[PDB]
Structure 1
């Protein structure tokens, strides 16, 4: 009924990094059952962003994930009511970001309200000096605790010249109604900035995600 092969995305993000506030809006399309999506993002407030844009892209919805039939799909069941998530991201040099997302459905469009706040990134680190290039393949491990869905991952940005910059994700997902809870599974995420402006005021973002079990 509710989940169609082609859906739209409309999103706004408001946040701050190291005290510098900003606002981004996005428009996109995705195929939920194939686990693919794309969106065009425009910076609307916050000058030219002074930090590496890669710290944001995982914040810009696990309904866009190919789930096989032997894994319970916590996310596609949760609609039309929807779900929210809460996330903390801890980088190996002390920068920490918190984020929230409230995802509702309206017609064939997902509406996303995102808040993002990062602090304590050093001035000579790869985020403030924009020395990140892309995220490696990311494996999210999802499990259940106290009746909500949690997930961990240990991800890595590659850096210009080689080497990697490590970040640990912790997410809590909360469906806005009772749904059936899955078993321990994992989701592989491929995130790619396909095209960007000079100072990243216009970014075209793509993600591909599939779930796996045994």
Structure 2
């Protein structure tokens, strides 16, 4: 049993995230539900107190294996199982700060566990990230290309909406690397449409978020694959 045969829905998720931003250390944990292909939620909470940064900015750090892929595009993230993959992220909030994340995953009993670290240095203490002035991030297209002999790369430019109704940009670059000591067939260049919706639980006493991601793969530009050898 490998690849897509390991991703029979419903499934669950867990996260453990150890973070630091501008010297403030924090932890998040969460549990989530993946009812069906491409629709996955996460109820995360800061176990150290208040989260010292925007929940909107930490949204993308909070599971590409749950994306919905048509049959005719390789689902690289799923085809890495068994063996798994790492994700390395750089998220540059333009004019504000840069953060990196490192993720490791394991699959057991229908549950994907993410162990993630986040490092963030030199953010503007009056920027939207540290003052928590963001309302949401807008849906984007993530460009996925083959990267080196065995990886992929994911790039996106994300619009973050502040409370005054104006936009800040984040520039996001990820490398996925199989860690299963085996070759995984690389997909053709393609795009992922991604939307995040965040809300609060009526009762939870913790600093928390209830997040849903919709993530759908598509060959949005048939000619793009020609450019990536």
- TM-score of the superposed pair, with normalisation by structure 1: 0.93
List per-residue Cα deviations over 1:35-76 (Å, max 9, x = no partner).
Answer: 01112112111x312321111111111111110122111011
Q: Would you tell me which structure has more helix in proportion to its own residues?
A: 2
C-alpha deviation, 1:196, in angstroms: 5.0
C-alpha deviation, 1:123, in angstroms: 1.7
1:16 aligned to which of 3, 17, 20 = 20
Q: Where has structure 1 moved over 4 Å in runs of 4 or more?
A: 196-200
Contact 2:96 2:127 in 1 (8 A): no
C-alpha deviation, 1:194, in angstroms: 2.3
Give distance in 1, aligned partners of 2:168 and 2:8.
Answer: 37
Q: Would you tell me which structure has more strand in proportion to its own residues?
A: 1
Q: Which residue of 2 aligns with 1:41?
A: 44
Any idea what SS the aligned residue of 1:122 has?
A: coil
Q: Which residue of 1 aligns with 2:99?
A: 97
Q: Is 1:118 aligned to 2:124, yes or no?
A: no
* Distance change >3 Å, CA 199–CA 89, structure 1 → 2: farther
- TM-score of the superposed pair, with normalisation by structure 2: 0.87
Q: CA RMSD of the aligned region, Å?
A: 1.7
C-alpha deviation, 1:199, in angstroms: 9.0
Q: Which residue of 2 aligns with 1:27?
A: 31
Q: Which residue of 2 aligns with 1:133?
A: 135
In the alignment, structure 2 segments of 5+ residues that lack a partner are 223-229
Give distance in 1, aligned partners of 2:166 and 2:96.
Answer: 18
1:153 aligned to which of 156, 160, 172 = 156
Contact 1:49 1:200 in 2 (8 A): no
For these two proteins, the number of residue pairs brought into alignment is 212
